[PDB]
Amino acid sequence: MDKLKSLIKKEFSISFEEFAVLTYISENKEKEYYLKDIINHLNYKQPQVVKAVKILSQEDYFDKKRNEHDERTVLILVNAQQRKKIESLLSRVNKRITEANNEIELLEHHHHHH
């Protein structure tokens, strides 16, 4: 695994694909979303986005439901407590990404090996 991906996964119990799902959700801030539309926008593949959504639903970040007119389509819903939890997570991950870069820059500013 990548070092920053491993650092985020160890700290938050969720991988960078889940952070990308939550980032897209925050960039499109609403009470409701379509899983089909999230799959179309994200760079990750359909089953990767499904696994990230599955993990985030199991971790209670949002609620999954079937569409009532055509059950092939799936929605994702965000309650007021979930909205605050998503902003809190995204800010803490951004803080850890920043601090990880600050440690890398400090290690490169420090003396190198012979």
From Swiss-Prot:
Keywords: Activator, Cytoplasm, DNA-binding, Metal-binding, Repressor, Transcription, Transcription regulation, Virulence. GO terms for biological process: response to stress. Its main location: cytoplasm. It is found in: Cytoplasm. GO terms for cellular component: cytoplasm. One of its GO terms (molecular function) is metal ion binding. The keyword Cytoplasm applies. The keyword Nucleotide-binding does not apply. Global regulator with both positive and negative effects that controls the expression of several virulence factors and the biofilm formation process in a cell density-dependent manner. Homodimer. Belongs to the SarA family. This is Transcriptional regulator SarA. The gene is sarA. The chain holds residues 20 to 124 of 124 of the full protein.
